[PDB]
Amino acid sequence: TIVKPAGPPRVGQPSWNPQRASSMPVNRYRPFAEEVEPIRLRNRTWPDRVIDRAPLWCAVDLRDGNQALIDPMSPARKRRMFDLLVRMGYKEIEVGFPSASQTDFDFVREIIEQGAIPDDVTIQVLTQCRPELIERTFQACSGAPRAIVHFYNSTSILQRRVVFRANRAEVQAIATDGARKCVEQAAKYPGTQWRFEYSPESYTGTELEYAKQVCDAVGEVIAPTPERPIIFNLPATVEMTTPNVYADSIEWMSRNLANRESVILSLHPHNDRGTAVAAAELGFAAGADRIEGCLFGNGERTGNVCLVTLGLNLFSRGVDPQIDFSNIDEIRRTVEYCNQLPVHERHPYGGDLVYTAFSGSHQDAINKGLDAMKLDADAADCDVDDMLWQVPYLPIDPRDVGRTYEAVIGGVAYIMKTDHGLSLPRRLQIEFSQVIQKEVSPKEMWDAFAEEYLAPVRPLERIRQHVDAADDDGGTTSITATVKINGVETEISGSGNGPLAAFVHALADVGFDVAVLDYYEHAMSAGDDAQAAAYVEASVTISKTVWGVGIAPSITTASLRAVVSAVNRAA
Amino acid sequence: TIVKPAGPPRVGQPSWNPQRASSMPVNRYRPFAEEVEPIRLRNRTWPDRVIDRAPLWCAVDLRDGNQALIDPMSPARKRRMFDLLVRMGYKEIEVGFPSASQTDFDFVREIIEQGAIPDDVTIQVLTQCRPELIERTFQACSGAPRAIVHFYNSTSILQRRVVFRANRAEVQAIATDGARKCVEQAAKYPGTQWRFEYSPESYTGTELEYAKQVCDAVGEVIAPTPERPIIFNLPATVEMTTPNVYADSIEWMSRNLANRESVILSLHPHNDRGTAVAAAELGFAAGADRIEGCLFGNGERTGNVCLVTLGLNLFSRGVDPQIDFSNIDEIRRTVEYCNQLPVHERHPYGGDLVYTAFSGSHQDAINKGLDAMKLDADAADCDVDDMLWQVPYLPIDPRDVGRTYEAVIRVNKGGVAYIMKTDHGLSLPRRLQIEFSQVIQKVSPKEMWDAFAEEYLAPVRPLERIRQHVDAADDDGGTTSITATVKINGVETEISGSGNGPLAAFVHALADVGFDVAVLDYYEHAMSAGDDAQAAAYVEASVTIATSKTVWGVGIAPSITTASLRAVVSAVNRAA
Ligand SMILES: [Cl-]
């Protein structure tokens, strides 16, 4: 549980800040400068540069995104994603990791053999540096008109130590041997226009001077030219610090890498700190050439940078993203189809609620803006739809992305579990939520729950019982119980496979035909001896289908009370 | 529909970049410097400042978040959100707009009158500057020990022209008249310690020299001191450009506002360009004192800056946020209840998928990271949970937020949870799914099922259970006792214990034979119905054998009683 922070305020903490120290283990975590290294960059210029052209975009939805999906893309979902990206304007598209996944291999084979790749589109495939994986990656691109082969190895301080147990030279050699293998394989495959991309993986946790060394050495192997450049792709595999620091890193690399005219400098930001878009836009101002991301920011854990956000951050400040988002609804509808994950309600530009105003005040200002625009448009013999957009609270004309401005005019599971320790089966929440419709407070809701499932002792009251279970696995269990039927003390008895069966059969003898449809039980604290909650759904005749709830210190008794509760609900 | 861009490349555009001009109407949109002004700050210092203290936080969930919801919070939802924020450690909470809505007025009365406000907590209320509204904002607050009155009016180039059709002088008087009224009203209620917050609303669409001018003006009326400071809140009402320019804007206001030592400088970013967190973090290094936001990014349109991301971004780089997030799921569940909007699967720190790894090589590197951390704790006679987190792909120990790392395995219409329920009728508890996933990691339906049987169902060593007699009390809350016949590494022994049901009894029985089984959790469900009906039981326990390990055990049987007993045996045996 959540414990109010209660430790001493910092020394020199303002009188007007009453915040207390928390007990979170901050000391397991270090500043970025200490975890990795301090900023090497003298005379940054990214903070003074405003973006005025589209980067080169590369969409990694088919590999990076797909790898991150609970339900990965079927071959049809892939074609549909591929085709959306092509039709939006993307010229570079990561289509798989052929050497690690047969489905990836077959998909690559499919778009090449089907003739599915437009003439201005380059496909990109991911590989690790092992010779047998490079080989198999080239195998998969066989007969491609042009391909990016993207090889990588982890270079961070952490990984060198704990993943590879390798020093700097050994780790540069993984990368440069990969590059040598790449040059070899490309000569073995004529006619395909081979292009290379190298990532120092976990770049954000790597010494810059070192990343430059590995990169430069890899460039020396490939021998790129201004005509036939290499891509150095520099990922925030984990987003580790603030975007200005990423950007300092990008500017430093851009300035220090050898043979810069032959390098396409590429960014691959993840969103661990919630700042992937910022890292990209500042990194772009820092001298990157290219950005890898996904539509709506799909990718492991927090995701890759959002391509859509980036593109429309350009459009809404007067820069052509060179990608069509004139119908963001279709884009979103297809991305959700392919990924089987929703775009959040608040996601920039695409989310359900982003062109909505609930505030009466905001709606008035929007309309006052919209009117001025029409007054200026009628006074210029003009279509408003071509005027400079000037509307408070709306950054863009919703129409420009195929949307519209919306001027818009029970908590059972939560409260029962939070306040009561009760995990109600879904169908029970449903059944009971209907009952609570006749707002009801938490204290109030509970009184109604108790009155419905816990209190009634008529027509059925269970007084006590003797359970005689078979000692042997699979034997039969006997119950004798003392019950009251409409006040009337009665003995009942039954046999069954276990005690709840025995009790249920026993009930037949007093005019309750009961059949267990569903049953759940859970602990109610930690510990050997804790209370149990039991939930029984039963059809009950003398034929209504009903839930009962039982709470008791025993698994058995809870379950028995759950049956009594059902029977009394049935009546 | 979507048509490929097909316009010409830009002039200068490199041969290796084949993109085409699109038909998007960019001409309807201008650079920020043209839309608003050029913000030049050649001598800025925010890029060289790393954050080393938590800001003063203010939570606006009950106002900016609430206004933004499809379904506004009921009184109960309001109260629940307010209590969560107190309990996390927020000391300033904006509780509503009580002059604008009766439900907000009512809420503010409810908390004041029922004594819900801690001594170290200062409630905040929003108001516009119309004197009837300022009066009603003070009335709402009658009998509060302290409160921040937050008044605002819009000051942007666009609204001054199209919304107000007004002079600079005109629009500034709206503000200073609001301030005057606040001062006169604060005198009518001596029982409350009043503080003021002023926002030039749509700040990011406003000339800086004008924002300063209006704020300075307001401060002259209110006359704050280092001991009674004013708040000046600078909203990115619409997030209009990149967070560096916002940061420049803050550093300049921090350096140039009159009476700076009597100013608490507050930031209030929205997320229209998806960079609200960056704005707040860069703006804080720029010299701000305070940040207004919402848990999980709720609020108007794209939302207010996420307080959880900000606070845990401090935590994970070694700065104490002074807010507890150590059960981020309790926070998530509560926020979802209150807002009735879900926290996205990939939301930083909190989304369902942020502590998972699907990648085989990530999974392998995570394990190597964990093993290496463990060898270092043993070498140092230390708790590994106490030491420097050093695991690739995981910025934090998920346990530090009450979460669990999950190596998610792919099952050949797929997924472990889904295949178990459908093929075998088992609803595995989430933490069992995680645990068993890890077993696999260390896949067809058959491989998965057989792996499952091999882990949890099959083992008869160390412990096996032949038979038992359970003696239940007839009367409720009586003792059950148990004798059981059991083979311990093949040697038949006899065991004895008592407990509140035969589960507990059986667990206590096993302690005489060198198994310390401490039940942490327990679940049971029906499989099938009738005479071909069975019970699935799952038990979580910390188990020690004659070194302690947390494991699940699964048991399946016709009896709800014997299923549970099987579960305990499965548990003891998984631990061995
Ligand atoms: Cl049973």
Ligand SMILES: [Cl-]
């Ligand atoms: Cl029990």
Ligand SMILES: [Zn+2]
């Ligand atoms: Zn990646």
Ligand SMILES: [Zn+2]
């Ligand atoms: Zn706001």
